[PDB]
Design a binder for this molecule. Structure first.
Ligand code: FHT
Ligand code: CL
Ligand code: NI
Ligand code: ZN
Length: 329
């Protein structure tokens, strides 16, 4: 068994190995990468996502989100307060202001300690799920706007044409902006490229242990769990690494820097925070190995979750028994 301890693996593909995206995902899994739930991919030195980032200030963040926290420092929920629209240039200046700028710190570990100590006492502003791409059209390798779509994958595997598209999203972050514990919609894969700016720290639970995190979440957020059998689909719950270790939950952590890809694997729970102003791009994707995960993926039928993008057709084909219930909610 490859990677039996479920460590996060880091890959350094050559420019030749960087041509065939599907092949390299398969290669990483042959080495046991998926057992961690998260892998880092450092692109070859010959590669660039685009020429510069000098001309992105005019992008519009139509609905910036202020992340207000409730709870204790290591166990808390956050809700998203909608703010007036602002451009990326305005957002960058806001992130670097005294109220929101990264504090002095000596290393990633020091900043991590500051994050979990002080996160709940602030409310950073986040730009998320903005349809778009910053990859140059001339970038042919690992361009997140040019992967095979999930709709085509299901057709190839199961023989069924379905409606729907599969396009990338942009994220604008600042210090303490937070993504709560979650798996992807339908427990899909995701791939995230950090285009620009300060790092993002990730936490991840191995897919083979995801149910352990679910059980701890039910214990730590008991009202939330009574309201929905899959409330982590709401993407509002945070649990610190200290509390995870206290409860024996298997997990790993890693910091992603500009110019690095991260891939999350099916049913790999992950959470994290941004260190300062940055810009990332991400999209979900599927492989033949995902189909079995899609069939078994939990759903939220209580109304809250909504979604990154339409799962209707995936639920309809892969989970026909659930379709009606999930539909009504
Ligand atoms: N799969 N998504 C991610 O892992 C994560 N975004 C979220 O979890 C998220 C939560 C609530 C809302 Br609303 C919108 C998005 C991310 N990726 N790069 N930056 N953040
Ligand atoms: Cl701080
Ligand atoms: Ni995610
Ligand atoms: Zn729900």
């Amino acid at each position: 068994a490859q990677n039996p301890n479920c460590n996060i693996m880091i890959f350094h593909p050559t420019k030749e190995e960087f041509n065939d995206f599907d092949k390299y995902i398969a290669y990483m899994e042959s080495q046991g990468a998926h057992r961690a739930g998260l892998a880092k991919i450092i692109p070859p030195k010959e590669w660039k996502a685009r020429e510069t980032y000098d001309n992105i200030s005019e992008i519009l963040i139509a609905t910036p989100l202020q992340q207000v926290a409730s709870g204790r420092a290591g166990v808390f929920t956050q809700y998203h307060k909608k703010k007036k629209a602002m451009t990326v240039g305005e957002y960058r200046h806001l992130a670097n202001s005294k109220k929101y700028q990264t504090p002095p710190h000596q290393n990633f570990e020091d900043l991590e300690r500051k994050y979990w100590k002080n996160r709940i006492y602030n409310s950073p502003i986040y730009g998320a799920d903005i349809s778009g791409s910053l990859f140059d059209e001339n970038t042919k390798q690992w361009n997140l706007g040019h992967l095979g779509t999930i709709q085509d994958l299901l057709e190839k595997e199961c023989g069924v044409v379905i409606e729907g598209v599969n396009t990338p999203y942009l994220y604008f972050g600042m210090w303490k902006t937070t993504f709560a514990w979650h798996t992807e919609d339908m427990d899909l894969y995701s791939i995230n490229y950090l285009h620009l700016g300060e790092p993002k720290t990730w936490y991840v639970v191995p897919p083979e242990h995801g149910q352990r995190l679910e059980r701890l979440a039910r214990e730590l957020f008991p009202g939330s769990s009574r309201g929905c059998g899959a409330f982590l689909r709401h993407k509002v719950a945070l649990i610190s690494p200290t509390v995870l270790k206290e409860n024996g939950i298997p997990f790993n952590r890693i910091t992603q820097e500009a110019g690095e890809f991260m891939v999350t694997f099916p049913y790999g729970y992950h959470a994290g925070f941004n260190h300062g102003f940055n810009c990332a791009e991400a999209i979900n994707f599927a492989t033949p190995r995902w189909i079995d995960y899609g069939k078994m993926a939990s759903q939220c039928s209580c109304g809250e979750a909504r979604v990154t993008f339409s799962m209707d057709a995936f639920v309809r084909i892969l989970q026909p028994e659930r379709y009606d219930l999930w539909k009504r909610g």
